[PDB]
Amino acid sequence: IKKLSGGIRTALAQYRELAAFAQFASDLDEATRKQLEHGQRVTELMKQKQYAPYSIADQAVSVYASNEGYMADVEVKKIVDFDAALIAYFRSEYAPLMKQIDETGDYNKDIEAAIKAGIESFKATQTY
Amino acid sequence: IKKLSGGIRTALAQYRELAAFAQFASDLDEATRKQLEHGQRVTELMKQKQYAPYSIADQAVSVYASNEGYMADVEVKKIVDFDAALIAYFRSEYAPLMKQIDETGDYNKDIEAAIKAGIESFKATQTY
Amino acid sequence: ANLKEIRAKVASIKSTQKITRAMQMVAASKMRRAQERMAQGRPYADNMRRVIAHLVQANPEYKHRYMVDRPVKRVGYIIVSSDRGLAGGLNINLFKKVVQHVKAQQEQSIEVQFALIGQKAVSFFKNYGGKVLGATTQIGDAPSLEQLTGSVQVMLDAFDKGELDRIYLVSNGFVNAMTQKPKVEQLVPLAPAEEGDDLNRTYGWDYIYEPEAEELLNGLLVRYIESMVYQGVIENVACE
Amino acid sequence: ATMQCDVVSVKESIYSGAVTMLIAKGAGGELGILPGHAPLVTLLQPGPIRVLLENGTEEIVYVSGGVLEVQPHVVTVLADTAIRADNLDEAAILEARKNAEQLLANQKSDLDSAAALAALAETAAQLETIRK
Amino acid sequence: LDPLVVGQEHYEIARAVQNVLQRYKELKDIIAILGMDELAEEDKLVVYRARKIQRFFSQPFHVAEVFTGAPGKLVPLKETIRGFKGLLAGEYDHIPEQAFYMVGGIDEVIAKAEKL
Amino acid sequence: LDPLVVGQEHYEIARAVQNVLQRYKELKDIIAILGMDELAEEDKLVVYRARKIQRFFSQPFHVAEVFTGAPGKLVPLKETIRGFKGLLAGEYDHIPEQAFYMVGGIDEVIAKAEKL
């Protein structure tokens, strides 16, 4: 969690900086437009309904997907539902790993390879 | 009075909204120009001297002249002079009607026709 | 004097300041775009001036009327200004200079006609009065020349009858990002200067044209005038 | 033998390339100009240009009217109306770009009106109410 | 107005209506000095839907005996929900706006539109 | 101050003066935030007239020679009325606003304006 929260924090700060450009037409140098898109999607990621506590493992998976930008392609208006779908697939297909991430919290480099491979598989095969 | 007050009420209400954009007349469509003009004319007819009470007929004639667009040709100034001259002329020549309006306070097609005829007669062949 | 009134005022001013700063950044970004566009046809008009220099070089015996002045009369002023407000004093300064120079001819009583491109220009000229023979609006940040060909075309057609004497063009000059000048110039007569290129090393054989060079310059001349007016209006847009 | 070709429009550049030979169709029928031919200035027509090179790509640029000066030193063309679109009657994209520019003009006018008037009048009229 | 107590459909339709109203409020035709001719079907349709919903807010009542024959219309909750769903979906974009005023029910308004 | 007690011209002059000054005081805010070029030309004229009026109300005194070293002055009422009527008419617009300070009577102002 400590190694993954920096990206979300800095993205939110950058988005908070570029505020009024949201109301105005966003046409601008790419960098600003890309920052605006990423800020919109990251603030959309924070939505969460009531009485549904997310675990550490799915939290890490979601934050890693956000930081790596696997959710850039998906339309913003459909992000949150997509989010849930991903967790579901990951929850059942890659369940043995989730017993380890939750119980230990270690970030041995391998945990990253498995998460990335699962994310690639879900993006390639399943549909939201 | 109940039949006639509505037009001035709605004109004054609308003129309250376009107030902020008053130092900037050039940047607006013709509709707002006409609305602002009408609001100015109406707010200038509501000025009266002390110890000079008007009678029901005076108010009726003035409001009918305003609502029916009979003061669209007069500049924003001289409105008070036009009001005074019309009221004075109507008391002198159409006194029998004025008495009926004062005593009864009724509205009917005959009264509308008579008021229209009198206002049209005064509009020409007279000075303010 | 109520505390809530002051709180509302300060909140509103904070929001307004933020949006105005954002608009300043937007305007800063837009500034260069036009600077670049000017640099694009700048060589065009430069090579175009090199062309017009070659054009005047042609038909040595023949003389076009665009290079002489008739009795000074029928002055025509073309005005280019913003379609929106909040351009600082540029619009009001240009219009003040316009009216002051209008007194000049008005001083010797020279008849004054004007054409306008800006919306504030049309508002000012309607409030002042007079009759306008050409009025345009909503030209755009990068207007196609066709958007503006009509005004110059009708003006030149009117001058072709000899009724007018010459046209006194008005526009703003952009010196640096912080400095502009309301400038007034004259365009109808043309005089070459420092165009000695291709003259000290000119070919001995006479340039013979398969097309008739007698009329070849004519279209280029009108091409020259439309190019220069387009350059002026785009320069004014960039300065705005 | 390749030939350079610098020819641009008033608004912006049009084309520049290493074209070995050209056959101007604007004037004098199909007048062939080759590296070493005498310089000439002619008058175009509302028809596409003809130029060919070693790469063999057919750079066909339709131009309506305009003049041209051609020489082994330089090849120039006044591009009043002209697009690099391959064949005549290909302006649909050009029309789309014009519509996009008009849309951008509408959006920028919207932003200008909103920001310049609404907020400033709101705060000024708010400030019009005296602080104390 | 929790999603669970009122139903997901009711929650989402109420949120959509609130968003449309707020969008029209921020985009007034006086807020945009140019007035109309902007955001065609992007914010125009928003304006028209706001007008239609505003008129549909009007409800005749029994007590107001003027112009009304003791109507006492207690409209079924569903009918209102289905009418607003139809309005949001856009199937009523052809219905005249003035037909939506002084309406007892979505059927009532259908009859009022179809007569003239 | 009512038309019967003082007359008509007195009342009209006083009312016009107060109106102009109120207009300028109201206008001050947008000038404070935005600037001068944006206002309408009539509002610029109102600004200049208000400044000149505010200065013309100044006057040296008899018991205040010591402070300023300038002799006292006295102005008849009709001269005040004439000066303010002329000022509001628009005939003293070209006279610089620096000539209206600490001088009594419209004429002394003409002399001071020439002196500058």
Side-chain angles (χ1 to χ4, degrees):
Chain A
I1 292 297
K2 187 169 59 56
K3 292 184 183 71
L4 287 188
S5 92
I8 167 178
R9 195 176 65 258
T10 185
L12 260 205
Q14 293 164 305
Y15 173 71
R16 212 174 325 116
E17 202 279 334
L18 290 100
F21 296 105
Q23 274 71 17
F24 280 83
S26 174
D27 61 356
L28 295 174
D29 289 345
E30 315 307 289
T32 72
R33 200 178 73 238
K34 288 147 55 65
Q35 280 185 293
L36 206 47
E37 305 297 303
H38 184 55
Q40 290 178 1
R41 301 179 205 289
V42 73
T43 188
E44 280 247 23
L45 178 79
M46 221 79 38
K47 311 265 200 60
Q48 175 160 352
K49 295 154 311 309
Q50 212 208 331
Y51 294 136
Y54 273 24
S55 174
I56 294 99
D58 61 356
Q59 266 207 118
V61 159
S62 165
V63 169
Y64 184 81
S66 177
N67 297 0
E68 294 320 295
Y70 291 113
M71 56 177 39
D73 299 326
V74 49
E75 183 146 29
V76 48
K77 319 202 141 282
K78 219 164 303 173
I79 183 72
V80 47
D81 55 76
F82 156 71
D83 181 65
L86 177 63
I87 288 185
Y89 164 85
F90 256 97
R91 183 65 65 185
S92 60
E93 267 66 38
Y94 307 122
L97 169 81
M98 307 262 146
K99 184 185 193 301
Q100 183 193 325
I101 303 301
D102 293 322
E103 298 297 335
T104 51
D106 272 1
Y107 197 54
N108 64 34
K109 62 180 180 295
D110 294 352
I111 294 169
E112 164 217 21
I115 278 174
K116 181 157 46 56
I119 294 169
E120 287 292 335
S121 70
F122 172 80
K123 186 70 172 302
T125 76
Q126 303 315 114
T127 70
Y128 62 86
Chain B
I1 291 306
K2 179 182 183 178
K3 177 56 217 70
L4 292 202
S5 82
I8 86 164
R9 191 176 301 119
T10 179
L12 267 191
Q14 184 172 3
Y15 172 69
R16 212 150 31 235
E17 261 179 329
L18 295 174
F21 305 103
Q23 295 85 0
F24 326 101
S26 153
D27 59 10
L28 266 173
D29 289 345
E30 297 320 293
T32 48
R33 314 282 181 74
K34 183 178 179 180
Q35 161 54 44
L36 268 182
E37 175 269 342
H38 205 244
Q40 294 202 283
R41 305 302 162 71
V42 163
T43 201
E44 191 144 347
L45 177 63
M46 305 285 255
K47 300 166 169 272
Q48 193 188 356
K49 293 179 179 179
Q50 207 185 345
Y51 306 129
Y54 274 177
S55 178
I56 303 181
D58 299 317
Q59 310 182 8
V61 171
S62 51
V63 167
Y64 191 81
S66 160
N67 273 353
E68 286 309 306
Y70 276 76
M71 38 166 81
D73 53 349
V74 293
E75 39 198 355
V76 69
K77 54 191 170 292
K78 308 178 60 60
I79 279 284
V80 198
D81 319 311
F82 178 66
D83 176 28
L86 169 63
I87 289 296
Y89 166 79
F90 259 44
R91 298 296 299 278
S92 82
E93 288 207 355
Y94 299 83
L97 175 72
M98 287 268 150
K99 163 88 70 151
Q100 179 185 1
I101 293 287
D102 298 352
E103 264 66 0
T104 85
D106 299 0
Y107 200 32
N108 191 17
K109 287 316 290 188
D110 53 1
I111 274 163
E112 178 170 3
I115 277 186
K116 289 177 51 56
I119 276 181
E120 299 278 4
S121 81
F122 173 83
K123 192 77 180 317
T125 83
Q126 209 53 255
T127 68
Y128 291 4
Chain C
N2 192 4
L3 215 63
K4 327 294 117 180
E5 302 171 350
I6 304 302
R7 193 165 312 120
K9 290 169 171 300
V10 304
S12 55
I13 282 146
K14 285 166 174 303
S15 60
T16 320
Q17 180 180 59
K18 292 149 195 47
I19 83 153
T20 42
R21 188 208 327 279
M23 189 53 148
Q24 172 201 0
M25 264 88 79
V26 166
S29 65
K30 260 188 181 169
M31 150 84 91
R32 300 288 182 268
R33 311 172 189 180
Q35 186 173 355
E36 323 310 299
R37 294 183 181 277
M38 294 300 293
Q40 303 311 300
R42 181 177 65 83
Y44 206 86
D46 289 345
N47 289 337
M48 264 301 320
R49 293 182 183 174
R50 303 174 180 179
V51 167
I52 67 88
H54 292 302
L55 275 44
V56 301
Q57 279 159 44
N59 317 339
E61 160 253 302
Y62 162 64
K63 183 178 179 180
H64 199 62
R65 59 151 193 176
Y66 277 139
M67 292 177 72
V68 82
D69 180 53
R70 293 182 183 174
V72 49
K73 183 190 183 69
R74 296 286 293 172
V75 309
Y77 304 159
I78 170 67
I79 310 307
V80 279
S81 73
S82 165
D83 50 356
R84 318 297 302 177
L86 289 88
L90 186 69
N91 274 350
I92 76 149
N93 281 126
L94 190 52
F95 292 138
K96 181 259 301 173
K97 175 167 285 292
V98 158
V99 77
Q100 294 194 312
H101 200 306
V102 154
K103 293 179 179 179
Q105 312 282 5
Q106 186 173 355
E107 183 178 2
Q108 293 177 335
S109 85
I110 303 301
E111 293 177 350
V112 175
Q113 185 64 60
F114 40 80
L116 51 94
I117 310 293
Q119 178 171 5
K120 316 300 288 185
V122 83
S123 81
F124 165 80
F125 270 153
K126 285 317 287 172
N127 190 284
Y128 147 74
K131 184 69 215 72
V132 187
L133 74 158
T136 48
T137 315
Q138 297 307 119
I139 61 171
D141 284 12
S144 64
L145 308 104
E146 47 96 3
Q147 185 64 60
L148 293 184
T149 38
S151 57
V152 278
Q153 190 61 60
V154 71
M155 159 63 59
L156 258 299
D157 160 78
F159 176 60
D160 282 313
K161 314 152 185 49
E163 293 177 350
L164 289 88
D165 173 57
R166 59 176 182 183
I167 297 314
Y168 216 77
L169 180 137
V170 182
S171 66
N172 307 295
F174 165 87
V175 175
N176 311 300
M178 332 307 293
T179 299
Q180 338 295 339
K181 63 188 185 295
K183 60 179 184 185
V184 200
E185 70 99 28
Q186 177 44 237
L187 177 63
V188 180
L190 71 173
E194 278 294 328
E195 288 282 15
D197 186 17
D198 292 0
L199 280 192
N200 54 301
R201 45 172 310 287
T202 172
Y203 284 165
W205 55 269
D206 167 48
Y207 216 82
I208 309 178
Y209 297 77
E210 293 177 350
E212 194 35 76
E214 193 28 64
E215 293 177 350
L216 177 63
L217 62 80
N218 282 73
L220 295 174
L221 265 49
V222 299
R223 258 74 167 182
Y224 150 80
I225 215 59
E226 53 88 7
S227 63
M228 306 274 324
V229 300
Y230 176 77
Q231 294 300 320
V233 302
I234 303 301
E235 183 178 2
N236 183 22
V237 166
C239 172
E240 188 255 351
Chain D
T2 174
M3 174 65 211
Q4 293 177 335
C5 295
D6 289 345
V7 63
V8 298
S9 167
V10 175
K11 183 178 179 180
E12 183 178 2
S13 169
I14 283 283
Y15 173 80
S16 290
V19 296
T20 59
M21 293 183 284
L22 75 159
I23 319 296
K25 316 188 313 160
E30 263 76 7
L31 177 63
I33 306 294
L34 62 80
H37 203 291
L40 264 193
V41 180
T42 299
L43 184 61
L44 217 66
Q45 279 312 303
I49 303 301
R50 183 40 61 238
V51 305
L52 301 98
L53 83 163
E54 293 177 350
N55 182 222
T57 299
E58 184 80 287
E59 297 92 358
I60 170 174
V61 170
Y62 176 77
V63 194
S64 64
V67 175
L68 62 80
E69 58 102 354
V70 64
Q71 336 177 335
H73 182 242
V74 175
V75 184
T76 323
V77 175
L78 194 170
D80 184 1
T81 291
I83 189 58
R84 181 177 65 83
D86 284 15
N87 294 338
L88 177 63
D89 204 9
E90 183 178 2
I93 314 106
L94 159 74
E95 297 332 290
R97 105 180 72 181
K98 170 184 301 300
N99 202 4
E101 167 72 291
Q102 175 267 3
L103 159 79
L104 183 68
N106 287 6
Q107 289 177 352
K108 68 162 280 295
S109 181
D110 188 294
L111 302 185
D112 184 1
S113 66
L117 266 296
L120 298 185
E122 171 263 347
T123 181
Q126 173 74 101
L127 188 66
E128 181 195 62
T129 316
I130 278 154
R131 66 209 182 277
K132 69 204 161 49
Chain E
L1 194 66
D2 289 345
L4 295 174
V5 295
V6 175
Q8 213 278 344
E9 66 289 355
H10 192 167
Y11 182 89
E12 62 174 351
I13 190 184
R15 282 311 168 180
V17 163
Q18 168 184 119
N19 252 313
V20 161
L21 270 204
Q22 171 70 294
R23 188 81 193 76
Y24 174 64
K25 150 176 261 191
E26 57 164 74
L27 211 162
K28 291 176 186 180
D29 310 308
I30 64 179
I31 283 299
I33 61 171
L34 295 174
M36 324 305 300
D37 289 345
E38 318 289 324
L39 293 149
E41 283 314 282
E42 308 139 58
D43 262 300
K44 183 169 71 172
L45 180 75
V46 166
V47 172
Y48 295 93
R49 294 207 194 290
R51 302 276 190 81
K52 283 174 278 183
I53 304 171
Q54 276 276 6
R55 309 309 175 77
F56 208 77
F57 292 151
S58 187
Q59 168 91 5
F61 287 120
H62 181 293
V63 179
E65 295 185 61
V66 50
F67 283 119
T68 83
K73 293 179 179 179
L74 188 147
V75 175
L77 84 159
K78 39 226 292 197
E79 183 178 2
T80 70
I81 277 167
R82 79 185 212 81
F84 277 117
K85 264 189 182 179
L87 199 32
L88 263 301
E91 63 192 272
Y92 295 161
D93 282 358
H94 58 75
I95 304 192
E97 153 184 351
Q98 70 279 5
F100 276 99
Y101 176 56
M102 294 300 293
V103 158
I106 200 55
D107 311 355
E108 191 279 355
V109 78
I110 291 195
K112 193 84 59 56
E114 69 91 14
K115 38 165 266 300
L116 60 98
Chain F
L1 193 49
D2 53 343
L4 302 188
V5 172
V6 305
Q8 183 73 24
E9 194 184 358
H10 195 300
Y11 200 57
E12 299 174 308
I13 290 307
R15 267 316 160 256
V17 154
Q18 279 184 303
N19 174 26
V20 158
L21 283 175
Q22 168 57 238
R23 275 282 317 147
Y24 176 55
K25 166 181 170 177
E26 145 193 346
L27 272 194
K28 269 181 187 171
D29 277 316
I30 168 177
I31 284 282
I33 278 178
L34 221 73
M36 262 276 298
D37 322 314
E38 34 278 51
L39 305 191
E41 302 292 323
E42 302 91 7
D43 289 345
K44 299 196 192 77
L45 213 70
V46 161
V47 159
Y48 296 150
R49 283 194 212 282
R51 293 187 80 74
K52 295 175 184 162
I53 284 175
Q54 221 163 9
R55 302 211 204 296
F56 190 82
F57 272 130
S58 64
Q59 201 203 15
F61 276 6
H62 281 243
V63 300
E65 282 201 20
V66 52
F67 302 114
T68 61
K73 286 294 189 302
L74 200 68
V75 172
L77 175 62
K78 310 175 313 304
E79 277 313 296
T80 301
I81 297 312
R82 174 165 74 80
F84 274 98
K85 166 169 56 57
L87 183 46
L88 289 178
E91 81 188 37
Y92 300 143
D93 47 356
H94 64 305
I95 291 177
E97 64 199 8
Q98 278 168 231
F100 287 71
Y101 184 55
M102 300 281 195
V103 175
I106 199 66
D107 272 350
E108 279 176 22
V109 158
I110 306 285
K112 194 170 177 181
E114 171 269 347
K115 186 78 49 59
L116 284 193

